[PDB]
Amino acid sequence: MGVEVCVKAAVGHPDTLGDCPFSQRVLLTLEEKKVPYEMKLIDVQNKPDWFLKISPEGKVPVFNGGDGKWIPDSDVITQVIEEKYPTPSLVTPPEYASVGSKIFSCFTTFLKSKDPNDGSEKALLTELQALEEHLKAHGPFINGQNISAADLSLAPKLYHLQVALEHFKGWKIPEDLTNVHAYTEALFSRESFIKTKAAKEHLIAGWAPKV
Ligand SMILES: [Ca+2]
Ligand SMILES: [Ca+2]
């Protein structure tokens, strides 16, 4: 049957797409593979019962590939989509799987930090520098000329990084990391990314209580 995906609505705005980066990874995957799908927005503070019946732990995103079940976990979901819709191939080589894997967590720790000298900035910078070296050697995407799964996993997280760190801390990725800047400027301007990203005010609102 028809492909369907449940994703988070923006806080306080039930008919507006939210900022959940795992949801966005899934949506980016469907968009780039040109798969038709229906999107269902879930108010995670007011979940509807029909949703609780198919997602009993309230987990979002969940994906229905037309095979009579709803599955969680954006890793698993994007692999299922890869298997079902092989072209374009978004397979990322295993040796590039962990590229930028610590960026989001380092970002969250630095964002929530209220002590300038606790070392979280240095850690974030170290991970960004690793991304920079990888992109220099193997760019422009994580797997060269063709976009792939690792890009679609990483781009939503870098979007959070840029918007939230600039807003809350007035912090920006250093300009000498030119490959990272080319990377984020390229990814954020893709039609798929513009279509599936949160409005910045909603992303900022989402981070406000956590900060
Ligand atoms: Ca709304
Ligand atoms: Ca915006």
UniProtKB/Swiss-Prot annotation:
Induction behaviour: Induced by heat shock. Down-regulated during senescence.
Biological process, per Gene Ontology: ascorbate glutathione cycle; cellular oxidant detoxification; positive regulation of salicylic acid mediated signaling pathway
Location in the cell: Cytoplasm, Cytosol
Application of this enzyme or protein: Overexpression of DHAR1 improve ascorbate pool and redox homeostasis, and enhances grain yield and biomass in paddy field conditions.
Domain called GST N-terminal: residue spans: 10-89
Outcome, altering residue 47 to A: No effect on catalytic activity
Binding site for glutathione: 8, 19, 47, 60, 74, 160, 207
Active site: 20
Residues annotated as transmembrane: none
Recorded GO MF terms: glutathione dehydrogenase (ascorbate) activity; glutathione transferase activity
Every GST C-terminal domain range: 73-211
Keyword entries, A-Z: Cytoplasm, Detoxification, Oxidoreductase, Stress response, Transferase
Residues annotated to bind L-ascorbate: 8, 19, 210
Protein EC: 2.5.1.18, 1.8.5.1
Domain of life: Eukaryota
UniProt entry tagged with the keyword Transferase: yes
SUPFAM superfamilies attached to this UniProt entry: GST C-terminal domain-like (SSF47616), Thioredoxin-like (SSF52833)
Subunit structure: Monomer.
Sequence similarity: Belongs to the GST superfamily. DHAR family.
Function: Involved in ascorbate homeostasis. Maintains redox pools of ascorbate by recycling dihydroascorbate (DHA) to ascorbate. Involved in scavenging reactive oxygen species (ROS) under oxidative stresses. Possesses dehydroascorbate reductase (DHAR) activity in vitro. May function via a ping-pong reaction mechanism with an electron transfer at the active site. Possesses chaperone-like activity in vitro.
Stored PANTHER family: GLUTATHIONE S-TRANSFERASE DHAR2-RELATED
Protein name stated in the entry: Probable glutathione S-transferase DHAR1, cytosolic
Organism of provenance: Oryza sativa subsp. japonica (Rice)
